[PDB]
Design an enzyme around this catalytic site. Structure first.
Site, PDB file in Angstrom:
ATOM      1  N   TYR A 193       0.825  -1.204   0.000  1.00 26.87           N
ATOM      2  CA  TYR A 193       0.000   0.000   0.000  1.00 26.87           C
ATOM      3  C   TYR A 193       0.861   1.256   0.000  1.00 26.87           C
ATOM      4  CZ  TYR A 193      -4.986  -1.121   0.406  1.00 26.87           C
ATOM      5  OH  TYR A 193      -6.284  -1.498   0.150  1.00 26.87           O
TER       6      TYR A 193
ATOM      7  N   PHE B 255      -7.201  -4.788  11.144  1.00 31.09           N
ATOM      8  CA  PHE B 255      -7.534  -6.044  10.481  1.00 31.09           C
ATOM      9  C   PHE B 255      -8.105  -7.029  11.493  1.00 31.09           C
ATOM     10  CE2 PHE B 255      -6.975  -7.022   6.130  1.00 31.09           C
ATOM     11  CZ  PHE B 255      -6.046  -6.157   5.587  1.00 31.09           C
TER      12      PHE B 255
ATOM     13  N   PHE C  76     -13.994   5.424   9.890  1.00 33.30           N
ATOM     14  CA  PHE C  76     -13.991   4.036   9.446  1.00 33.30           C
ATOM     15  C   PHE C  76     -14.577   3.106  10.507  1.00 33.30           C
ATOM     16  CE2 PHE C  76     -11.451   0.243  10.413  1.00 33.30           C
ATOM     17  CZ  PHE C  76     -11.868  -0.611   9.408  1.00 33.30           C
TER      18      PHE C  76
ATOM     19  N   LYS D 178     -11.132   4.765   3.265  1.00 30.40           N
ATOM     20  CA  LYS D 178     -10.419   5.559   2.266  1.00 30.40           C
ATOM     21  C   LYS D 178      -9.634   6.722   2.874  1.00 30.40           C
ATOM     22  CE  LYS D 178      -8.930   7.207  -1.562  1.00 30.40           C
ATOM     23  NZ  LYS D 178      -8.219   8.293  -0.824  1.00 30.40           N
TER      24      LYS D 178
ATOM     25  N   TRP E 259      -1.750  -8.033  -3.374  1.00 35.70           N
ATOM     26  CA  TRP E 259      -1.902  -8.726  -2.102  1.00 35.70           C
ATOM     27  C   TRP E 259      -3.163  -9.585  -2.073  1.00 35.70           C
ATOM     28  CZ3 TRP E 259      -5.509  -8.209   2.003  1.00 35.70           C
ATOM     29  CH2 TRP E 259      -5.160  -8.904   3.169  1.00 35.70           C
TER      30      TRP E 259
HETATM   31  C1  LIG Z   1      -7.696  -2.632   8.382  1.00 38.41           C
HETATM   32  C2  LIG Z   1      -7.931  -1.444   7.847  1.00 38.41           C
HETATM   33  C3  LIG Z   1      -6.954  -0.330   8.071  1.00 38.41           C
HETATM   34  C4  LIG Z   1      -9.165  -1.176   7.030  1.00 38.41           C
HETATM   35  C5  LIG Z   1      -8.824  -0.286   5.834  1.00 38.41           C
HETATM   36  C6  LIG Z   1      -8.069  -1.029   4.734  1.00 38.41           C
HETATM   37  C7  LIG Z   1      -8.841  -2.253   4.270  1.00 38.41           C
HETATM   38  C8  LIG Z   1     -10.205  -1.833   3.739  1.00 38.41           C
HETATM   39  C9  LIG Z   1      -8.076  -2.974   3.173  1.00 38.41           C
HETATM   40  C10 LIG Z   1      -8.777  -4.278   2.817  1.00 38.41           C
HETATM   41  C11 LIG Z   1      -8.975  -5.136   4.063  1.00 38.41           C
HETATM   42  N1  LIG Z   1      -9.758  -4.396   5.064  1.00 38.41           N
HETATM   43  C12 LIG Z   1      -9.940  -5.224   6.266  1.00 38.41           C
HETATM   44  C13 LIG Z   1      -9.044  -3.175   5.458  1.00 38.41           C
HETATM   45  C14 LIG Z   1      -9.824  -2.476   6.571  1.00 38.41           C
END
Ligand SMILES: C=C(C)[C@H]1CC[C@@]2(C)CCC[N@@H+](C)[C@@H]2C1
Ligand SMILES: C=C(C)[C@H]1CC[C@@]2(C)CCC[N@@H+](C)[C@@H]2C1
Ligand SMILES: [Mg+2]
Ligand SMILES: [Mg+2]
Ligand SMILES: [Mg+2]
Ligand SMILES: [Mg+2]
Ligand SMILES: [Mg+2]
Ligand SMILES: [Mg+2]
Ligand SMILES: [Mg+2]
Lengths: 304, 304
Positions: free
Chosen positions: A54, A74, A140, A168, A295
């Protein structure tokens, strides 16, 4: 499934191997995993790998912060699948003053002190930039248990909501923090459309690869927390096709968003609105989109 | 615009040319065309050609009936673009009892006696099969001026509406009529899913190719009658991409519907439910899909 051709070249941070060992090792000591199978699965996911994909141009002494933050979010994201919206909200709201630093953590609860120590260390390194991540993160976290997940949504309404559930803004602020990329409010305002377009790419690419995982979750986890909320299911319903067919169609749409990203960037320069910081920013957004894809199509989190 | 690969092979009725001259000649003689430019554009469209591509296995002495019905409905379809929803409704409702034969036509008004003479001759050739086209046509007529056309729609809601506006049901009844293909209520109920899937293909393929014509109409004709109603515009809204980008995504989607058609037919056959009539019917639907695409990508109606 075979991904359509992309002009985006994914990049990974040079220190991915060192940082992965560092951050995985940290969570393996502090986080409370149910068993050995969950511990193996955590490492197999490669949460620091996706972070390095990322933000490949993150500063060497800041990349580990991003890996730690993404890793814990996560873990929480999966944790919420076994809770109701009410339980999940209370869980997240507890961590918010702790993230701010306004409230001390219960050091017997891993998620509380991990979050606290993380945000303290981030403010210690760069107070101004670390603070700009707070509200985007809380945005978020509060979207994760929004009752709208239990309401019928069209494609447009979903993507509008998913911009928050996909985090985002937090990804944007964290990228800037990790790169030490400072932007004026005017510069930030200039790339709004680019942000919105990038958000759809991140969301749908994730939807495409994580569908099988989330379908199983909907059948086994909590009725509310495990609810199936994805563009794959939505397009399949709307267009009356299989989930697999929806994936293939959505992937073509993702490539169109890549084309749009390039056009919007080129237009930004043509309108004489591109600054050196903005050039690095929109390039960074591209790394997020391509890094997210690389990924997603390789991680065991989605394949098993 | 390069179409994705397809296994559907188009077929055209052997008598396409002589029937074209017969049917075009009739309308050139009776229909009230405003000028010579409009008469040439009418012939250039190839309305009997698309009909013969839709029903390539129609009986030799019935194909002209289909060409006439489609032709007059094509002409009315364009006529409605300069009217309001109210005017369009009053125009169509006037033709409905006349189609049934319950009300005599005003012989000074071309559209009225053309509609009347058509249905009368169709009933004379095959009373039962002709009657079963009536209501499906009326359903299509009323959808043309339905106010849902001017209200917000998602992809799914649009496809559900377009099935009536694309006249899927009248096309099916016309196909059966033209081929002398009689199916029982039970048989027709077995291929309902196949019909619904076929409708989406016909609709979107038309939407893709007729977009430029309809964009221009919306800018120049009546704000209601000429309103932009197409999957191209809707997907472009939901996904925030250009119309050109929407087309490419929608075309891939059409191929998924072709794949679904094949799966549904194969399952129908495997369950021992594919009667000789159904086999001819579902093959007929495929001719409609491939025939619609061939004409759409070559007709001057959409390219000029
Ligand atoms: C874990 C994160 C920082 C959030 C933002 C980033 C993500 C959308 C990327 C895909 C997986 N999801 C689980 C995460 C959830
Ligand atoms: C005019 C018709 C007979 C209906 C059925 C046939 C079509 C779908 C073919 C494409 C163009 N549209 C206008 C017509 C609409
Ligand atoms: Mg999740
Ligand atoms: Mg989530
Ligand atoms: Mg997902
Ligand atoms: Mg690749
Ligand atoms: Mg039309
Ligand atoms: Mg129409
Ligand atoms: Mg059209």
């Amino acid at each position: 499934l075979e991904p359509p051709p992309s002009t985006f070249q994914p990049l990974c941070h040079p220190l991915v191997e060192e940082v992965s060992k560092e951050v995985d090792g940290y969570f393996l000591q502090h986080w409370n995993f149910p068993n050995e199978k969950a511990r193996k699965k955590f490492v197999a996911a490669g949460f620091s790998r996706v972070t390095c994909l990322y933000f490949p141009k993150a500063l060497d002494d800041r990349i580990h912060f991003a890996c730690r933050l993404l890793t814990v979010l996560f873990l929480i994201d999966d944790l919420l699948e076994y809770m109701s919206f009410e339980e999940g909200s209370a869980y997240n709201e507890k961590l918010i003053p702790i993230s701010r630093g306004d409230v001390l953590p219960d050091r017997s609860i891993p998620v509380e002190y991990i979050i606290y120590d993380l945000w303290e260390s981030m403010r210690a390194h760069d107070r101004e930039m670390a603070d700009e991540i707070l509200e985007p993160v809380f945005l978020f976290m509060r979207a994760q248990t929004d009752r709208t997940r239990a309401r019928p949504m069209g494609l447009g309404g979903y993507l509008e909501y998913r911009e928050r559930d996909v985090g985002k803004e937090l990804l944007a602020a964290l990228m800037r923090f990790s790169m030490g990329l400072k932007l004026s409010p005017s510069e930030l305002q200039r790339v709004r459309e680019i942000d919105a377009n990038c958000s759809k790419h991140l969301s749908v690419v994730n939807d495409i690869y994580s569908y099988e995982k989330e379908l199983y979750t909907s059948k086994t986890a909590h009725s509310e927390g495990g609810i199936l909320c994805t563009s794959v299911q939505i397009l399949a319903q709307e267009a009356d096709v299989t989930a697999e067919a929806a994936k293939r169609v959505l992937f073509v749409m993702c490539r169109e968003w890549e084309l749009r990203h390039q056009l919007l960037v080129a237009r930004l320069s043509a309108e004489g609105l591109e600054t050196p910081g903005l050039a690095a920013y929109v390039e960074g957004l591209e790394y997020q989109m391509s890094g997210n894809e690389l990924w997603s199509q390789t991680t065991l989190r989605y394949s098993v």
